[PDB]
Every structure is written in structure tokens, then in C-alpha cells.
Amino acid sequence: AIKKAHIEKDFIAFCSSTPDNVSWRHPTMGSVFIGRLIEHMQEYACSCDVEEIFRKVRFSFEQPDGRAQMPTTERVTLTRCFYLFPGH
Amino acid sequence: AIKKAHIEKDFIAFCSSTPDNVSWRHPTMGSVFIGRLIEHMQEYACSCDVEEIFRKVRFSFEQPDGRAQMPTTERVTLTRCFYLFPGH
């Protein structure tokens, strides 16, 4: 017996900036977005679902300096919370 | 004194289906997505932030029937949780 499934589901995109805008990068330190994401994953993977973590990264960019960017969550079809449960 | 602000921030789009796909509508009952959103807002506005509510609507569409669709959250730049606090 064949059953129907949604063609597109359980996706989440996380971009480094909003449309039209640049994302910043340090020659020895890497990308600002990537570095911030590693920090937040490391700290919050154990307590938050990935959508929450992405918001916290965004919040961490809330106060703009000379090199401002605002990471964007896109095309979200997560029906559930995704907890990484690091250590498990 | 002038200060910098992100050009795009604190946005959330909620579409009725995923790209390429149709959204269903009943001639006397209205749109399936709209009806489901009203239900979930009515029940969950008091306990969840709007991002959570949108996920629950999505989850409610998880099991496809003859008229299947998967609502999509798009272009999210919310840095905080948005609670409606109905009654306040």
C-alpha cells in the first residue's frame, strides 16, 4: 500500500545576513556569523532546540557596530522541536 | 547623535504552503490554512510565542489527506519571543 507524504518538510535554513546585504569576515578569525554560530551551538545545544539557538545568534547581532549583519531563518517546515541532545 | 539600525529586523512571514504548491479552500468554510491558524491562535496565543504557534499549525498539517499542504515560515528576523498575552 502506498501513502502520501509532503514533498517538502522538516527543513530549516539559516543565512548569515538579510537579503540585499553583506556578511562580514576576518582574515584570521573567519566569518562573524560562523564564529557566532559555533559559540551559540556550543553553549545552547544542550538546552535549546535549533530554532531557539538561531534566534539567540540573531539576538546576539541585535546591537550593530561598524560591521552590521542580521542572520535570517528561511523556508522553515519543522513540525517539531529539534534538540541535539549533545552527549546522546 | 545618529545611531545605526538594522534595515530589516523583527519580521516573520507565514505562508499557507511550500513553494511550487497549492493551498486549499472550501466554498463555505474558507481557507484550510486560515481556519487552522485561527484555531491555533485561539488556543495557544496565551501560552506560546507566535513562532511556536506557527510550528503547531504546521504539525497539525503533518498527516496529509486528499488535500495536502505544508505552511511555511519565511524570512524570520525575530530576535526575541513574541507573546501576544491575550487579555493584556
Added chain:
Amino acid sequence: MPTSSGSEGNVKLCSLEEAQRIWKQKSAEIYPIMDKSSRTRLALIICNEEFDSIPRRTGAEVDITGMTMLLQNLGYSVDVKKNLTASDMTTELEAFAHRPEHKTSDSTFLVFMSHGIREGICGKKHSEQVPDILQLNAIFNMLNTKNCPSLKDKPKVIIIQACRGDSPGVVWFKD
């Protein structure tokens, strides 16, 4: 006994304890809510039902009724606009972003209900030969900090009821 006779209607209320629990469980990571007595919350509904060439969206009136009442229950003054071209929609959106009440508001809801193709939302004058489309990108640009400073740092919720192409959105699998 809870009652739908009140201004919040069928929307379940958030108790004073619930509001305090949420304000504790999550820190300064909640959007600030403005004083109820003085806030001028705005919402806009653009719904297209009658179209020149494409079929009539029967049932759209039930959608308008429900969405208008729900945003009101949540505290928003609801503007309802009907059967507009992509040009009219832009003009109306611009007018919305220029409303003084956004200054004394904490949030906004934008609702678009219409036909839709892959590229965006359909105006009343839409056909294959002469497209009448409002891009989602355009809505965002008009409500962003450049074009709507009054809504700076404030949640802007955009809701779209529309098709995004002709496909049923499904694939078969066997158990």
C-alpha cells in the same frame, strides 16, 4: 466560566500568573508589550475575491470575518481592503507604513489572502499574458526600518493565504 462575550472573544486568556511565569522562564528575550490603556495597535487585511480573469475565491468572506475578528481579539484595529491590483496593494501598504499609530504600538499583523503563483501574490487584474503580482520581497521592503521607522524593533507578522504554484505538494511512499 470563561466567556466569548468579551473583547477577546474565542481567544483563550493569559492569566496574571501565566504572564509572570513566562516573564521568568524566558528572560529579557521577550518583545516588550505596551500599556493596554494607551496603545494603538494596527493590523491590515488585503483580501482578493473577485478577479477579472482567474476564478473567484469562493469562501474568502469567511476568511475575512475570522481573521478580522481574531486580530481584534488580540488587540489590533483591523483595516480591510478588497480586490486590489498589485499597484493598489503597494499604495495601501505604503499608506499603512505611514500611519501615525505605529508610533504608539508594539507590533503589527499584515494579512494577504489572494490567488498566488510561484513569484508572489496575485492582483485582481492578473492573467498569464499580463501578470499582476506583488512579490513577498516588496512587502518586506515597505515595512522595514528604512520605509517604516515607526515599527523599528517591533514584531511584524505577515500571513499569506495563497497558492505558490500548481503542484499538489505530495510524493508517494510505500510502508
Added chain:
Amino acid sequence: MPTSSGSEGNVKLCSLEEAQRIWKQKSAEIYPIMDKSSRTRLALIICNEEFDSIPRRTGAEVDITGMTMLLQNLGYSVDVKKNLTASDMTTELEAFAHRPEHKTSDSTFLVFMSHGIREGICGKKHSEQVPDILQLNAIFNMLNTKNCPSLKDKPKVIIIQACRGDSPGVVWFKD
């Protein structure tokens, strides 16, 4: 004393109590996690550093190191691909969606790090006259249920480090 000498490195661990608390606070609204002893988790990193015409992405190696280690800490086997055209990226993505390990996995991470314009991610051969672009839409299509049934009902996280245009993304306001 917690230690980064373990396989999870600098990633803070989730205690057995924490895992049980989350499994209670949120109901059957969490994605199922597969048995650690038998799961074959996969992740893919496509990073472009050297480009034919557009400037070299100095620091990209620090990004590869960090992302590769982080996905490993989280339990994913990380495939690292470098300096690819939009055509190569498509081919590699197709190859990723065809990996048998997705059958015995619970989730996937896709990471794209490159230059980028409004329309998508830049391949190594990108210039203004001859664009070499991978659209975000294309990534999604290749990992969706039609083209990747093995990942049906499983979280697919896509991460993009790229510009999306030339603008600084800021507007001035006075206090």
C-alpha cells in the same frame, strides 16, 4: 570537571536529567533521536575559498575547521568539499542525497560557505558576465522527500555563510 578531550569537545553536554526534563516539558513534539550505538549521522560542508575572478575568501579555513569539528561534536560525519562550481555543488549534493547512511540517521546538516549575490551562492567560476550561481531553492529540491526519501520526516538544517547583495544592511536613526 567537564572536559573537551571527549568527542563532544567544547560543546556543553545535556545531562540525563536535562534530557528527561525536555522530554516532559515538550510532549511528542520533539524529533526522535536514533540510538547512538548504531546511527550513521552525515553532514556536508561545501566551502569556496579560491575563486577565478572574485576576491579570495581569506579566513575560510578557520570556518571549515570550526564547523567540521562542531558537527562532529554533535555526532555527524563531516564531508568537506572545496572550490566547486555551481555544477559541481549540484553533483555533490545529489551524491549526498544518495548516501545509504541517511537511512540509518535521524538528521542532517548542510553547510555552504562562499561568496554570494542576491540570487544565490557563488561557484568558483563566478563573474558578472558569466554567473556561476547555486540557488537556495535548488538545495531544498535536492534534499526534499522526492529526491531524498531517506531523509523523510528528519530535520535538515542548511547553513549559509554568504553575502546576499552589496548593501551594508543599516539605516541611521537619531535618539
